[PDB]
Every structure is written in structure tokens, then in C-alpha cells.
Amino acid sequence: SMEQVAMELRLTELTRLLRSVLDQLQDKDPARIFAQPVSLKEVPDYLDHIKHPMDFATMRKRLEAQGYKNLHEFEEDFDLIIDNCMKYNARDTVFYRAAVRLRDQGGVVLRQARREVDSIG
Numbered sequence: 001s002m003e004q005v006a007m008e009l010r011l012t013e014l015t016r017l018l019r020s021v022l023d024q025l026q027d028k029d030p031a032r033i034f035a036q037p038v039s040l041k042e043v044p045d046y047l048d049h050i051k052h053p054m055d056f057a058t059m060r061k062r063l064e065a066q067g068y069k070n071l072h073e074f075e076e077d078f079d080l081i082i083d084n085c086m087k088y089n090a091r092d093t094v095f096y097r098a099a100v101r102l103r104d105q106g107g108v109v110l111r112q113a114r115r116e117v118d119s120i121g
Contacts (some may be wrong), residue, residue, distance in 0.1 A: 028105040055082035
């Protein structure tokens with residue numbers, strides 16, 4: 001149908017907008033602590049600790065395969081990156097401190113993103 005064509009135009013432009021949110025969240029991690037999945041070679045027991053790993057490159061692959069059906073799905077994936085880090089790493093670490101900063105500075109970018117999806121539909 002043509003009504004599936006228009007559905008994809010209003011997805012495609014969530015995808016296009018979600019691209020821009022991610023670029024901005026990822027600029028709040030200049031240390032690149034969250035750019036890539038935690039290495040199972042380097043942390044072989046990681047899955048004993050964290051059942052749903054997430055990282056920016058993994059969020060991005062799902063993005064360019066148009067796999068986030070709304071903003072809430074994207075926000076869940078972002079919250080995993082932070083929550084996983086805050087459990088796996090202790091409070092007095094560069095990792096935990098980097099998550100706390102990413103959370104705090106992402107909040108502003110997401111608070112605007114929410115309004116732009118509602119407003120633009």
C-alpha cells in the first residue's frame with residue numbers, strides 16, 4: 001500500500017531525528033568509555049554480572065537498521081548503558097563517575113528530544 005509508504009516516511013524521520021540525539025549523547029562521553037561493547041575477551045565473566053549489555057555502537061547499528069519504533073525504546077537502551085556501568089563498577093571509579101556525568105548531561109538533550117517527537121508527531 002501507499003499507507004505503508006507514509007508510515008515509513010514518519011519512521012525514517014524518527015530514525016533521522018534519533019541519529020541526531022545519539023550524536024549529542026555520545027559527545028557527552030569524550031573519553032569513549034561507552035563507545036563499544038564491553039570486551040568478553042577482557043571481561044570474560046561480564047555476562048554473569050550484566051544480562052543486557054549496551055553501548056553506543058550497538059545502539060547505532062540498531063538505529064541505521066531502523067529498529068527503534070519510538071523514543072522510549074531509545075531511552076531504555078541509553079539507561080542500560082548507564083545502569084549497567086553503575087552496577088558493574090564501584091562508586092570510586094572513573095567508569096562509574098563517567099556514567100553519572102553522562103546521565104546528568106544527557107537529561108537535558110532528552111528533555112528536548114521528548115518535546116520534538118511529541119510536537120513533530
